[PDB]
A paper describes a structure:
Crystals of [name] (BR) were prepared. For BR1 the initial mesh scan was carried out using a Gaussian X-ray beam of 20 µm in diameter with a flux of 3 × 1011 photons s−1. As might be expected, the protocol described here is particularly amenable to systems (i.e. thaumatin, [name], Maelstrom) that crystallize in high-symmetry space groups.
Here, an automated procedure is described to identify the positions of many cryocooled crystals mounted on the same sample holder, to rapidly predict and rank their relative diffraction strengths and to collect partial X-ray diffraction data sets from as many of the crystals as desired. Subsequent hierarchical cluster analysis then allows the best combination of partial data sets, optimizing the quality of the final data set obtained. To demonstrate the general applicability of the workflow described here, we have applied it to various systems and scenarios in which many crystals of the same type are mounted on the same cryocooled sample holder. In all of the cases presented our workflow has yielded data sets that are fit for purpose.
Author numbering:
A (entry chain A), B (entry chain A), C (entry chain A): 6 to 152, 167 to 228
Write the structure that this text describes.
Amino acid sequence: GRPEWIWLALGTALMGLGTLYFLVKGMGVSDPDAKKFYAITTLVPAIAFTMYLSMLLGYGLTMVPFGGEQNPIYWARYADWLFTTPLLLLDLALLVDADQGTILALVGADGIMIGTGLVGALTKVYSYRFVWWAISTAAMLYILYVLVASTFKVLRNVTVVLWSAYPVVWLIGSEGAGIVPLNIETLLFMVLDVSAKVGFGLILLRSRA
Amino acid sequence: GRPEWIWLALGTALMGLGTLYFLVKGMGVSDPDAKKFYAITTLVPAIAFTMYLSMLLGYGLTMVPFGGEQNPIYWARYADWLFTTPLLLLDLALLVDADQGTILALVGADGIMIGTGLVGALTKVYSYRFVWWAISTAAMLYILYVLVASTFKVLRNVTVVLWSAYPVVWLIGSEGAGIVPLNIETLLFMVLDVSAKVGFGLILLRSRA
Amino acid sequence: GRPEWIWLALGTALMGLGTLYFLVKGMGVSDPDAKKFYAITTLVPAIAFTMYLSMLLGYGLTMVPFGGEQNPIYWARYADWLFTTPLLLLDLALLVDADQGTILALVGADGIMIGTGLVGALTKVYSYRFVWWAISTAAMLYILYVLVASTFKVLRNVTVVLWSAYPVVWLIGSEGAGIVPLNIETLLFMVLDVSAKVGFGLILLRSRA
Ligand SMILES: *C/C=C(C)/C=C/C=C(C)/C=C/C1=C(C)CCCC1(C)C
Ligand SMILES: *C/C=C(C)/C=C/C=C(C)/C=C/C1=C(C)CCCC1(C)C
Ligand SMILES: *C/C=C(C)/C=C/C=C(C)/C=C/C1=C(C)CCCC1(C)C
Ligand SMILES: CCCCCCC
Ligand SMILES: CCCCCCC
Ligand SMILES: CCCCCCC
């Protein structure tokens, strides 16, 4: 129906598969610590799965009026990111044994980041979308700024790299400037999401930290 | 007005009453541990009270189009369950001193469970409602799978038993197949809710664990 | 456009400024404890900033039908208060080293307080708005009831005093009786909000507790 359906069906399948893989691997885990990393890392694609599926079916899609057009906005991504991004930071934070003080900074900057992104997404005055983008981007840079040694270091690098593309994709995509069509937009986010969650989780869960 | 009002007024009264009872009983509690069980167990009907009331008044009711009809859906139940179900699992988890790792699995599976139930409830393609039902049901079975010795054992049994009816009621009720009318549906959930919260709480709070 | 814009622009600027001040001051903080108070206290105006801005721009404003009129309701305040009020109680609670049991009572009573306030705000039957007001007010009195020695004592007093005006303002404002216009209403909340967050935070962060 919608040309981007194939990328949504595919992300659904890969988050679906990735969840099951992590579930099965986390069986045989007595370790308090590993228990924690496993619950976190399996929850991330499990949530992604549900929101890829809601997008695949018409549910996590709405039409937002701006620039003289009704524009198709996938709101379900923010509902995913709202929980999946703090869990990933929490994976990193527990890894290096961050202070409560620092987790709350990361987690709270993270909610502001995707909170303001959602507002950007649904804002009906074109110009103001970019104000909300700018604010969310500044909350992202705070997180990067704030962001065993070896796998943390690797995981942080992957994070810094993949997370940074998201505002770039949103900015040039249908949420922002409309220069890259929803189609390739949805592919781009698909590859990003699977790498930041299943990829990130493979790295983390097969590692000894 | 609506034939099911009497069951909503009644659940409101019983959650209202149950909250006050637990409040009054929790006075004279110096114990850190008991403090924790009391705050949890009193919060559960206090939230239920507000959502029984929002349903009683027209607020937590919307009309969802599917199957060629506009169908009356009580969305306020999910807003209740979203917080009340993790608190009940938390009562059980603290009881047996579960790992952080395991609480996060329970709590996160619980949010997916009622998260997907809400989507099921509001989904406008009849067939897809049942996909969302199936996913939520599978998250429920995970929780049951994951789920002093004596009161835990009793409390777990009550939980396993009453929680399992909910998807059955939803499936045959107005959310699903429309074979049991909203009326008796609302009665059924009423009895279930009061038993899983006030009943569960009586058992737990009068016990010595 | 809207006469109350000047108070929204102003609250935006002061929450904006207050956030930056606290950020800059929290640099050079190695202390686990102070780390915690700083993350909490900086998050509070950072969130307020975003919701003052959403209100300034048309976003956090909706029209609710009651009393034969469509009434302008600023829903974005509840989205602010939902997170900012538990963080402030958490500042107080950590200050005096409250039990987990007591934090959960405070935090959960706090969510019910602003939860029911939101319902009040959007309720389309005039009379019922005041039922929801009454319930939220009773959850507030519970919190006050439940609510180093010196700065706690000072901070508690400020809290008791400023928080208590909010239901008074809502009751006489456009949410309730419509006796005080939105204009002065927005000014009143503006002064209250800046005092309860930036004022409260100055007191707390310059203090040695
Ligand atoms: C699994 C999903 C991941 C790791 C997604 C991360 C998303 C972000 C870092 C999003 C950032 C955004 C901005 C900085 C502004 C524009 C809107 C967003 C939400 C795309
Ligand atoms: C106090 C309320 C309780 C304990 C409610 C528990 C509710 C559930 C276990 C609901 C489960 C559902 C499914 C498994 C799928 C269909 C939708 C739900 C949300 C009714
Ligand atoms: C920074 C913001 C603060 C401290 C706001 C606090 C708000 C309240 C204590 C609000 C209380 C309300 C009622 C008790 C009933 C009417 C609705 C509210 C939400 C204004
Ligand atoms: C949106 C993620 C924050 C939820 C935390 C409430 C304690
Ligand atoms: C919906 C229950 C989860 C809220 C947790 C955020 C930390
Ligand atoms: C609304 C504040 C509560 C979020 C807590 C979920 C654990």
